[PDB]
Ligand binder design. Structure first.
Ligand SMILES: [Fe+3]
Ligand SMILES: [Fe+3]
Ligand SMILES: [O-]
Ligand SMILES: [O-]
Ligand SMILES: [Zn+2]
Ligand SMILES: [Zn+2]
Lengths: 323, 323
């Protein structure tokens, strides 16, 4: 009936139209060491995050899942200030980034101690049921991530702890796949350890342009997310035109009850400000929270996708996922 | 004539007896994501660090260089509290850990922007000449580190930025070597880029037991540090007996004006508390700040090392290094 948000429990039936994957804050691990030249300006960051929440509200969004990993600048008290300023429901996560771009030294060391998987499970349970730090905010999802072409031994510790925690709590699992790989393997691995496919979203599936790969993942009964609309030319990503082509193939095959859409925006960057060089800057110009509603959804409608199917992806699927 | 400490400038002639490499706080990258179960307990941490400082003071130590990297939990404000409570001179560092167990994702991304080396130089210069974050504290050394068997292209960016910053400021460079490798390569690369060997300490040289490797490094005119006394059977370390054997060969060759000694202790660990499993726990039992003075130094004297040589390593060499 309920899901934990940054403002406490909200009835699932009230989530409404939802973006399954956006970041209000995000930092690449190591941003903390650039604090002198990259200090966190709370007021301007809150202003920029509140504006991003406003743009989402302008298109009917009532709920955002922000799955920023623990080691990438997750800040639940900050998310709570965005939610209270805007009325947006925000669901945050507990979990670590994948080994390639995460901060693995700490839990790699706890492997040596022999307690890592159990420590991670303990962290998951505490943040799902008690609260994150002293904020009193519980995560509503477990975030998992794997590397390109491989679910590493480090990553598999988190996958096994997440399956253990889901059995105890019923929590939703959201994943990150790297460069269109390991979607089927992630689903198989979680299910083999007892995870509920109806409570799993395999993320970044738009990174693969082969519908056979998607159908193989969807056969496990899980949700998949085309959650990187607007990201072109970077992190190995395909174009939006390719995303739409792949998505249309699945929707015309009747998979609408298993698909959700998002942008994976980073609305405030942690660390030192930057500007993208001119090759990437142009390719990335549609990477913002209005892109699905101004550009992508109209293109899907012009391809014949009906309102009922869009409502299933944005409203029905997140309601079913969290209940 | 001055060096920056966590309390401000101190005359170099007043540093006195020095430990060149100890950590009051330290955390493996990723400890920040374990905040719920691994919160920082300042008071007990300050008490533990202060008791560590008081044990050092009982053996004559007046100054400690704490080179905790920026991405490993460096906390200059905390160090100032240890220094104010105890009267110890504490010199802190600016720098990042090596790629293998550091947090490279952030400055790896800035290499894509094409600004990484220049941003790191800017960070070094700000923290050496302006202040760290809003603490008003300046670093007194630049910390560099390389991986096992390689100075990676990521690491080389910091080496080049450090050489550039040293030319501007005259700041001392302290390095980490991994598992007894890259000593000569570090000295050669730094000198290639204009660094001053009289201002460089190649660290963890005790990780290599071949005196020819040390002599190869010493030929560059740099200092070397036997700075991991007490660490046995972890991170590839040799035994203290092997350290003493290597050190004795070098001292009998007349190298005392290039050698400094330390433990590389970690007196308060960041993140979740732990206890070492019992194979490592026994090998590591002498890893504390009194080990050099209770065990190692008496063993050196029994092998004929004179007080004048010990005073050169602990007092004369730090004074020459920082002036
Ligand atoms: Fe994301
Ligand atoms: Fe160290
Ligand atoms: O992501
Ligand atoms: O170290
Ligand atoms: Zn992701
Ligand atoms: Zn080191």
């Amino acid at each position: 009936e309920m899901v934990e948000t940054v403002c406490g429990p909200v009835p699932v039936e009230q989530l409404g139209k939802t973006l399954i994957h956006e970041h209000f804050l995000f930092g690449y691990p190591g941003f903390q060491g650039d604090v002198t030249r990259g200090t966190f300006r709370e007021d301007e960051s809150l202003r920029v995050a509140v504006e991003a929440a406003e743009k989402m509200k302008r298109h009917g969004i009532q709920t955002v899942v922000d799955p920023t990993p623990n080691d990438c600048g997750r800040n639940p008290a900050f998310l709570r200030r965005v939610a209270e300023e805007t009325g947006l429901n925000i669901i945050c996560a507990t979990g670590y980034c994948y080994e390639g771009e995460g901060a693995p030294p700490y839990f790699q060391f706890r492997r040596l101690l022999g307690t890592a998987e159990d420590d991670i499970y303990d962290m998951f349970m505490a943040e799902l049921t008690e609260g994150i730090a002293d904020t009193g905010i519980k995560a509503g999802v477990i975030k998992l991530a794997s590397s390109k072409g491989r679910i590493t031994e480090y990553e598999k510790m988190f996958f096994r702890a997440a399956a253990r925690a889901q059995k105890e709590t019923g929590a939703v699992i959201i994943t990150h796949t790297q460069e269109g790989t390991m979607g089927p393997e992630q689903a198989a691995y979680l299910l083999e350890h007892g995870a509920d496919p109806k409570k799993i979203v395999i993320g970044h599936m738009c990174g693969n342009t082969d519908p056979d790969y998607h159908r193989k993942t969807l056969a496990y009964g899980v949700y998949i997310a085309f959650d990187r609309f607007g990201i072109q030319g970077m992190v190995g990503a395909p174009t939006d035109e390719e995303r739409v082509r792949t998505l249309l193939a699945l929707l015309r095959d009747g998979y609408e009850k298993q698909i959700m859409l998002s942008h994976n925006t980073v609305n405030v960057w942690l660390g030192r400000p930057f500007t993208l060089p001119e090759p990437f800057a142009e390719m990335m110009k549609n990477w913002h929270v209005e892109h699905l509603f101004v550009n992508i959804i109209p293109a899907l409608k012009n391809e014949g996708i009906r309102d009922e199917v869009l409502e299933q992806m944005f409203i029905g699927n997140p309601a079913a996922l969290f209940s």
